[PDB]
Design a protein around this ligand. Structure first.
Ligand SMILES: Nc1ncnc2c1ncn2[C@@H]1O[C@@H](COP(=O)(O)OP(=O)(O)NP(=O)(O)O)[C@@H](O)[C@H]1O
Ligand SMILES: Nc1ncnc2c1ncn2[C@@H]1O[C@@H](COP(=O)(O)OP(=O)(O)NP(=O)(O)O)[C@@H](O)[C@H]1O
Ligand SMILES: Nc1ncnc2c1ncn2[C@@H]1O[C@@H](COP(=O)(O)OP(=O)(O)NP(=O)(O)O)[C@@H](O)[C@H]1O
Ligand SMILES: Nc1ncnc2c1ncn2[C@@H]1O[C@@H](COP(=O)(O)OP(=O)(O)NP(=O)(O)O)[C@@H](O)[C@H]1O
Ligand SMILES: [Mg+2]
Ligand SMILES: [Mg+2]
Ligand SMILES: [Mg+2]
Ligand SMILES: [Mg+2]
Length: 1190
C-alpha cells in the first residue's frame, strides 16, 4: 500500500516499506525529550509538501510554531485539536478519520488524553486504569475508519494496553548520544527501534541524528548509506563519487549534497531498491464544530476570530496573539507562570481595562499579596474592587459559583490555584494531608462553574505556578502545578515568563517578559507576545506600540532613527517609546490603526449580602468601604495602625498573626498591645518559647510586668494546650505567643507544622465565648493563614538620627489579611529605642493630612500659632503640652473612626501539666528545691530560689570570653564547699587547673574527663546521672559536640531528663547551637561581659550581667550584675555593697558610702575593700539581706 517518508532515510529502511503505512495506527513511544515530537513534525512535513492536509490532536499544548516552520511544515495549513477532554479528543480524531480526505492525524499525547472522568472526581478497578479502558473503547471504531480513508494515525507515548494491538507499527525512539562541533552541544544522536511490523519484517533498528533548530539530517545518513552500498567511495578522509571528488571529512560530504539537489535524489532511490473535493473538508469541519461547541478544531493560519466579547489584557501584542483582541467574556482563563514572572501585573492590568469600561470586578485572594498602591499606579480603581479573603479552598471556589449567578460581576480573579489550600489540609486530617492530592477539590466545583459564568458573561481568571520541586531537584515542568481539571475547562491559557530586565543606564528598572498563549479555543493557539514590564509603571503600552508601527508601516525605521511621516520622532527605541508618551492621541490613533489592521445596582447590592448571609459575616467587600462590623477593639498603640486596621484596634476573641523578619518591631508592637490592654484592666498572658522579653524595655513601654502572665512551656503542643484552657476562663483577655516558629513539637524534641493545624480549630471557638484575643508571631504552619481574622506585616525600612546617632527604626505595618473591615490598607510610624512606638510622631502627620495642622512648605502651624519647623521639632512640641495634643488626638479619631474564674482556673493548669509552668511575674512564690549557690549572690536572688535547682537541667550561654566557664567553676567551688562531689566534662580541652584552683575548686576531688567524641561525653554523664550521689555535672561545652548535632542530643536529652529527677544530680550545659535543651532546662542563663574593672591602668576585671532567661523554678526574666576578678573569682563583697545600698543598710551620699551615720568608703571601689577588712560587720549585713530576699 501507500507510504509516507518518516523524515529519516534509515527509518524508512528498517520499516521495510519506505515509510509509514497509510490507513493504519502507528505508535511512537519512548522517554521524553528523545525527539519524539521532531520525528512527528517531520512526517507532517514530508506529507505537507504533497497536499495531504493534516491533523494535530493536541493535549500537550507544547509545539513550537517556529521550530515547526524550520522543520518544514505548512503551519498555516495545519489542523490542530484543542480538545475539551480525552474522550472528546478520541472522537474528533475519529470524526476526521471518517471524513475521507483528511490524510494524516497526530495525537499529542497519549499520556495527556486524560479521561472525562478524571477531569471530574471519581474512581474504577482497572483505575488510572480508566484510560486503558477509554482506549479499549472508541478503538475498534477507529481501527476501521482508517483503512476506509487511507487515513494514517500516529500516537505518541512514554499506559493503555488496547492501543498496543491495533497499531500496525510501533517505534522505540531514544536519545542515546549527542553530536559535537568540537566544543558544543548542538547534536542528539538518536536510535529508533522497530518493535511492531505487520507491514514487513519487525526487530530491525536504525540510527541517525537531530540538530537543535534544524531537525532530522537524511543527507547525514545518506553519505553513510552510500558508503556501505558501493555508490560512494571512501578514500580515507576525502569522500568520492566515482572520480568526481565531493568533499573532505563527513562534515563537508554532508555539506555538499545540500548544494546539489538532483544528484542526491538519484542516489537516494538506488539505495531504497537495494534493501526494502475541498468541501469534503470545509463542510465536514463546521460539522465537528457545531457538534462539539463552537471552535474546537482549526487550521492554524487563519484570520478567523469569532466575535465573542473581548477584554483588553493591557498589552496590544497579547491581544494580537490571543487572536480575539482580548480575553473571552464569560469563560475560564488560567494564567500560569514561574513565581515573580509578572503574572499578577498582567492580572491587575485586565482588572484595569475592564474597570475603565464601567464594569465591576472580583478578587478572590488566598495569597494575601496585592499591592494596592501599585494597582493604583497600574490603573485599577481600588475603591470599587470587590475583594474576597476566603476562610478556605473549597469555600473560595464556592464564592465564585454565586458571584457567577449575579451577572453584574463582570470579571473574577482568583489568587491563586496553589494557595486555595483545601479543608482537609487546614484541619490536618490525614490520609491525603498528602497535599498535593486534594487537586480533586478543583475537579469538583469546576464542572459547575463552566455554565454559571457563560450565562452571566462573568469572566474568570485563575493564576498557577508549576512544580520542578520538593525544594530543588532537576526533573522537569509538568504543565500547571495545581490540578488536572483546569487544564481543559480553561477556554484560554497563558504562559508568562521573564527573560531580560532593562536598564536606565546602570539601574535595573525593567523586566522583559514573554507571554505564550498555549491553550486557545478562541482562535490561533501557540501564538506569542514579547514586551516590557516596568517597575512602578506597569506594562509598556508605548513600548510594544512602537514595535507594531514598525511592522505595519506607520512609523518608519531608518536604521536607528524613528520617523513619523517624514518628520523625525526618536533615535533608538528608547526615545521613540517615550515620544509617544507625550503626544497621546497620535499614539492612541496609531493604536486604533493597528487595531483596524489586525482585528443594575438592583441585582448587585442584593446578591452581595447574599454571601454574607451564607458564608460567614463579611467575606467580601468593596475596598473603598467605610463599613466596619462593630466588634470591640484594643488599640495597637499606633494610631495609624488602628486606622488602617479599619476597626480601630485588634478584634476581640479572634486570632491575629503578626509576622515579619527578625528585628522588625514585631515584639515592640506585641508588647504595646499587652500594655494598652493592661491599662484598661483586661489581663493578659504571654506564652514564651523564645525566652527573649526585655523586662526593662517592657516596663518603659508601659507594661505592668508584675501582673502579666508568663508561661514557659516544655512543648509546642503543651504551649498551645495551655492557651486552650486559658481561653476557657474568660479572664484572660489577651494571649500572646512568641513565637510560631519556636513552638517546636514533642516529636522534634521539618514536617510537624501539623501540630499547629491540630488544636487550632478548637481554640478558634473558645475565644469568641471569652473575648480572649490571641496573637501569634511568625517569620510556621498553613492553618494559621486562614483561621486568623487579622494578619499584620511589620518590616523595618529606615532609621532615625538625632544629629548623627542611630536612635530609631522607621517601620511599616501592612494589614494583609482583614476579615474585620477593609483589608490591604497600610500605616507607617516610628519606633524609638527605650520609649517605643512614637504616638506623637504619627499624630503630627495625621493632623497634616486631616488639615488640623498646616504645612507651610517647611513650617508647622496650629491655627494662627506656629508650632514647629521640620517634622522633628514639631513632633516634640505636642510632647511639650499634652493639652492640645489630647484634643487633636480625639478630633482625628472622630474624623476616621469576678476574680472567681481567675483565682481558681490558674492552679488548674499547674495540676494538669507541670507544677509551675505559668505564673504572675511579680511573685514571691518560689518552690521547694535543693538549691546550689551559683557563686554570685544577686544571681541566686534573681533566680528567686536561692540557686540552681537540684536534679533538673540548666543551660548557661553567651559569647566567647564572656565568663561562661568561670561561672560554672564558681559553682563547682561552692558545691565543693559542702561535700557534693563534681565532675566536669571538658569536651573543649579548656580549663587551666591552676586557674581553677585559684577560683576555689578542690582540684583533686573534681574527677573529670577529656572525651574524644560528643557521644562518649554524653553517655559518660548519662552513666553519672544514674551513678547515685555524684552531685553535680558541668559540660563544657555543647560546642565541640557537632558529632544531626541535635538529633544526637535529643537522644540522651530525654534520658538524662529522668535520670536526674531520680538522683538529685544537677546538670549544667554551656553554649555560645543545638535546640532541644532549650526546653529541657528548668533554668537558663544569659551571661555577657559588659565593662571591665580597672585599677588605674590594669585590666584586672570583667563587669558582668547575667539574665535569667528561662525559669521554671520561680519568677523568670530577672537579672543580676557583678564583678568577676581575674584569678580570684566572683566578688562576694562587690555585689554585697550594692545590695546593702538598695536595702537601706548602707546609704549613698553621691560618692560617699555610709554605715550607721559612720563614713566607710568614697567610690564603690574603696567601699568594697572596706567590707573585706571588717568581716564581722560584713557577715552581719550578709544575713540581713538574705532575710530580706530569701
Ligand atoms: N525550540 C527548540 N529549540 C531548539 N531545539 C528544540 C526546540 N524544541 C525541541 N527541540 C529539540 O527536540 C527535543 C526532543 O524532543 P521533542 O522532539 O520535543 O519530543 P518530545 O520528547 O515529545 N517532547 P516532550 O513530550 O515535551 O517531552 C530536544 O532534544 C531538542 O533537541
Ligand atoms: N511595588 C512595586 N514596585 C515595582 N514593581 C512591582 C511592584 N509590585 C509588583 N511589581 C512588578 O510585579 C512583579 C511581577 O510579578 P507579579 O505581577 O506580582 O506576579 P506573581 O508571579 O503572581 N507574584 P507572586 O505570586 O508573589 O510570585 C515584578 O516583576 C514587578 O515587575
Ligand atoms: N534592650 C533593648 N534596647 C534597645 N532597643 C531594643 C531592646 N530590645 C528591643 N529593642 C528594639 O526592638 C527591636 C525590634 O524587634 P523586636 O521588637 O524585638 O521584635 P522581634 O523581631 O520579635 N525580636 P526576635 O524575636 O529576637 O527576632 C529593635 O529594632 C530595637 O529597636
Ligand atoms: N589563665 C588565665 N588566667 C587569668 N585569667 C584568664 C585566664 N584565661 C582566661 N582568663 C580571663 O577569664 C576568662 C573567663 O572567660 P571564660 O570563662 O573562659 O569564658 P568562655 O566563654 O568559657 N571561653 P571559651 O571557652 O574560649 O568560649 C576570660 O574572661 C579571660 O579574659
Ligand atoms: Mg509535543
Ligand atoms: Mg498578587
Ligand atoms: Mg519578646
Ligand atoms: Mg570554657
Amino acid at each position: 500500500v501507500e507510504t509516507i517518508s518518516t523524515g529519516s532515510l534509515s527509518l524508512d529502511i528498517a520499516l521495510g516499506a519506505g515509510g509509514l503505512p497509510m490507513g493504519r495506527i502507528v505508535e511512537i513511544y519512548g522517554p521524553e525529550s528523545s525527539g519524539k515530537t521532531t520525528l512527528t513534525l517531520q512526517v507532517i512535513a514530508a506529507a505537507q509538501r504533497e497536499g495531504k492536509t493534516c491533523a494535530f490532536i493536541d493535549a500537550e499544548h507544547a509545539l513550537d510554531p517556529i521550530y515547526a516552520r524550520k522543520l518544514g511544515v505548512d503551519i498555516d495549513n495545519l489542523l490542530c485539536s484543542q480538545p475539551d477532554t480525552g474522550e472528546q479528543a478520541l472522537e474528533i480524531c475519529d470524526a476526521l478519520a471518517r471524513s475521507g480526505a483528511v490524510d494524516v492525524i497526530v495525537v499529542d499525547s497519549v499520556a495527556a488524553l486524560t479521561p472525562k472522568a478524571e477531569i471530574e472526581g471519581e474512581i474504577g478497578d482497572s483505575h488510572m486504569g480508566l484510560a486503558a479502558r477509554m482506549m479499549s473503547q472508541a478503538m475498534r471504531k477507529l481501527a476501521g475508519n482508517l483503512k476506509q480513508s487511507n487515513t494514517l494515525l500516529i500516537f505518541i507515548n512514554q499506559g493503555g494496553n488496547a492501543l498496543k494491538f491495533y497499531a500496525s507499527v510501533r517505534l522505540d525512539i531514544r536519545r542515546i548520544g549527542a553530536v559535537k562541533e568540537g566544543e558544543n552541544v548542538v547534536g542528539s544522536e538518536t536510535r529508533v527501534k522497530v518493535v511492531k511490523n505487520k507491514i514487513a519484517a519487525p526487530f530491525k533498528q536504525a540510527e541517525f541524528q537531530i540538530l537543535y533548530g534544524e531537525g532530522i539530517n537524511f543527507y547525514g545518513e545518506l553519505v553513510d548509506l552510500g558508503v556501505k552500498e558501493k555508490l560512494i567511495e571512501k578514500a580515507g578522509a576525502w569522500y568520492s563519487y566515482k572520480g568526481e571528488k565531493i568533499g573532505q571529512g563527513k562534515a563537508n560530504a554532508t555539506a555538499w549534497l545540500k548544494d546539489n539537489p538532483e544528484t542526491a535524489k538519484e542516489i537516494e532511490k538506488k539505495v531504497r531498491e537495494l534493501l526494502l473535493k475541498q468541501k469534503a473538508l470545509a463542510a465536514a469541519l463546521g460539522q465537528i464544530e457545531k457538534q462539539f461547541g463552537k471552535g474546537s478544531i482549526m487550521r492554524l493560519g487563519e484570520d478567523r476570530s469569532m466575535d465573542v466579547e473581548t477584554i483588553s489584557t493591557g498589552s496590544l501584542s497579547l491581544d494580537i496573539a490571543l487572536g480575539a483582541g482580548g480575553l473571552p467574556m464569560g469563560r475560564i482563563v488560567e494564567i500560569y507562570g514561574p513565581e515573580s514572572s509578572g503574572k499578577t501585573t498582567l492580572t491587575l492590568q485586565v482588572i484595569a481595562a475592564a474597570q475603565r469600561e464601567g464594569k465591576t470586578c472580583a478578587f478572590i485572594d488566598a495569597e494575601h499579596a496585592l499591592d494596592p498602591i501599585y494597582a493604583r499606579k497600574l490603573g485599577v480603581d481600588i475603591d470599587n474592587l470587590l475583594c474576597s479573603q476566603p476562610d478556605t479552598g473549597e469555600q473560595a471556589l464556592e464564592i465564585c459559583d454565586a458571584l457567577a449567578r449575579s451577572g453584574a460581576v463582570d470579571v473574577i480573579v482568583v489568587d491563586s490555584v496553589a494557595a486555595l489550600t483545601p479543608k482537609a489540609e487546614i484541619e490536618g486530617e490525614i490520609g491525603d494531608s498528602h497535599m498535593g492530592l486534594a487537586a480533586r477539590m478543583m475537579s469538583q466545583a469546576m464542572r459547575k462553574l463552566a455554565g454559571n459564568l457563560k450565562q452571566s458573561n462573568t469572566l474568570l481568571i485563575f493564576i498557577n505556578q508549576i512544580r520542578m520541586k520538593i525544594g530543588v531537584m532537576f526533573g522537569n515542568p509538568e504543565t500547571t502545578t495545581g490540578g488536572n481539571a483546569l487544564k481543559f475547562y480553561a477556554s484560554v491559557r497563558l504562559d508568562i515568563r521573564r527573560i531580560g530586565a532593562v536598564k536606565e543606564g546602570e539601574n535595573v528598572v525593567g523586566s522583559e517578559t514573554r507571554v505564550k498563549v498555549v491553550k486557545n479555543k478562541i482562535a490561533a493557539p501557540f501564538k506569542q507576545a514579547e514586551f516590557q514590564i516596568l517597575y512602578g509603571e506597569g506594562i509598556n503600552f508605548y513600548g510594544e506600540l512602537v514595535d507594531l508601527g514598525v511592522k505595519e508601516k506607520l512609523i518608519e525605521k531608518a536604521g536607528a532613527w524613528y520617523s513619523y511621516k517624514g518628520e523625525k520622532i526618536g533615535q533608538g527605541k528608547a526615545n521613540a517609546t517615550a515620544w509617544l508618551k507625550d503626544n497621546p492621541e497620535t499614539a492612541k490613533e496609531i493604536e486604533k490603526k493597528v487595531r483596524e489592521l489586525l482585528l443594575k445596582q438592583k441585582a448587585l447590592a442584593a446578591a452581595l449580602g447574599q454571601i454574607e448571609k451564607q458564608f460567614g459575616k463579611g467575606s467580601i467587600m468593596r475596598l473603598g468601604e467605610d463599613r466596619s462590623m462593630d466588634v470591640e477593639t484594643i488599640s495597637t498603640g499606633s494610631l495609624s495602625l488602628d486606622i488602617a486596621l479599619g476597626a480601630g484596634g485588634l478584634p476581640m476573641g479572634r486570632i491575629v498573626e503578626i509576622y515579619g523578619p527578625e528585628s522588625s518591631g514585631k515584639t515592640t508592637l506585641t508588647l504595646q498591645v499587652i500594655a494598652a490592654a493592661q491599662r484598661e484592666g483586661k489581663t493578659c498572658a504571654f506564652i514564651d518559647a523564645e525566652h527573649a522579653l526585655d523586662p526593662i524595655y517592657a516596663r518603659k513601654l508601659g507594661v505592668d510586668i508584675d501582673n502579666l502572665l508568663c508561661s514557659q512551656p516544655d512543648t509546642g503542643e503543651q504551649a498551645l494546650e495551655i492557651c486552650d484552657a486559658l481561653a476557657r476562663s474568660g479572664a484572660v483577655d489577651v494571649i500572646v505567643v512568641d513565637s510560631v516558629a519556636a513552638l517546636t513539637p514533642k516529636a522534634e524534641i521539618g514536617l510537624a507544622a501539623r501540630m499547629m493545624s491540630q488544636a487550632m480549630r478548637k481554640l478558634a471557638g473558645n475565644l469568641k465565648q471569652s473575648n480572649t484575643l490571641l496573637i501569634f508571631i511568625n517569620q510556621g504552619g498553613n492553618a494559621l493563614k486562614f483561621y486568623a481574622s487579622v494578619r499584620l506585616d511589620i518590616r523595618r525600612i529606615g532609621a532615625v538620627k538625632e544629629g548623627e546617632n542611630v536612635v530609631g527604626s522607621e517601620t511599616r505595618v501592612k494589614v494583609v489579611k482583614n476579615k474585620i473591615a477593609a483589608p490591604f490598607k497600610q500605616a507607617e510610624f516610628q519606633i524609638l529605642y527605650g520609649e517605643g512606638i512614637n504616638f506623637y510622631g504619627e499624630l503630627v502627620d495625621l493632623g497634616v493630612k486631616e488639615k488640623l495642622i498646616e504645612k507651610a512648605g517647611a513650617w508647622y502651624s496650629y491655627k494662627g500659632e506656629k508650632i514647629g519647623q521640620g517634622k522633628a521639632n514639631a513632633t516634640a512640641w505636642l510632647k511639650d503640652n499634652p493639652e492640645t495634643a489630647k484634643e487633636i488626638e480625639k478630633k482625628v479619631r472622630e474624623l476616621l473612626l469576678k476574680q472567681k474564674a481567675l483565682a481558681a482556673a490558674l492552679g488548674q493548669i499547674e495540676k494538669q501539666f507541670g507544677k509551675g509552668s505559668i505564673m504572675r511575674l511579680g511573685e514571691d512564690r518560689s518552690m521547694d528545691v535543693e538549691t546550689i549557690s551559683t557563686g554570685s549572690l544577686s544571681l541566686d536572688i534573681a533566680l528567686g530560689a536561692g540557686g540552681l535547682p537540684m536534679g533538673r537541667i540548666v543551660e548557661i550561654y553567651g559569647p566567647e570570653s564572656s565568663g561562661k566557664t568561670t561561672l560554672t567553676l564558681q559553682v563547682i567551688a561552692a558545691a565543693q564547699r559542702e561535700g557534693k562531689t563534681c565532675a566536669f566534662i571538658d569536651a573543649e580541652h579548656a580549663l587551666d587547673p591552676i586557674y581553677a584552683r585559684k577560683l576555689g575548686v578542690d582540684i583533686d576531688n573534681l574527677l573529670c574527663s577529656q572525651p574524644d567524641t560528643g557521644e562518649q561525653a554524653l553517655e559518660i554523664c548519662d552513666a553519672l546521672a544514674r551513678s547515685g550521689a555524684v552531685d553535680v555535672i558541668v559540660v563544657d561545652s555543647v560546642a565541640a559536640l557537632t558529632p544531626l548535632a541535635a538529633r544526637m542530643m535529643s537522644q540522651a536529652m530525654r534520658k538524662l531528663a529522668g535520670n536526674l529527677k531520680q538522683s538529685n544530680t544537677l546538670l549544667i550545659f554551656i553554649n555560645q547551637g543545638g535546640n532541644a535543651l532549650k526546653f529541657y532546662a528548668s533554668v537558663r542563663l544569659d551571661i555577657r561581659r559588659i565593662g571591665a574593672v580597672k585599677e588605674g591602668e590594669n585590666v584586672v576585671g570583667s563587669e558582668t550581667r547575667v539574665k535569667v532567661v528561662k525559669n521554671k523554678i520561680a519568677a523568670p526574666f530577672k537579672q543580676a550584675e557583678f564583678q568577676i576578678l581575674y584569678g580570684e573569682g566572683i566578688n562576694f563583697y562587690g555585689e554585697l555593697v550594692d545590695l546593702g545600698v538598695k536595702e537601706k543598710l548602707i546609704e549613698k551620699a553621691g560618692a560617699w558610702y555610709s554605715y550607721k551615720g559612720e563614713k566607710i568608703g568614697q567610690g564603690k571601689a574603696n567601699a568594697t575593700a572596706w567590707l573585706k577588712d571588717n568581716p564581722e560587720t560584713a557577715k552581719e549585713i550578709e544575713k540581713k539581706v538574705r532575710e530580706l530576699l530569701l
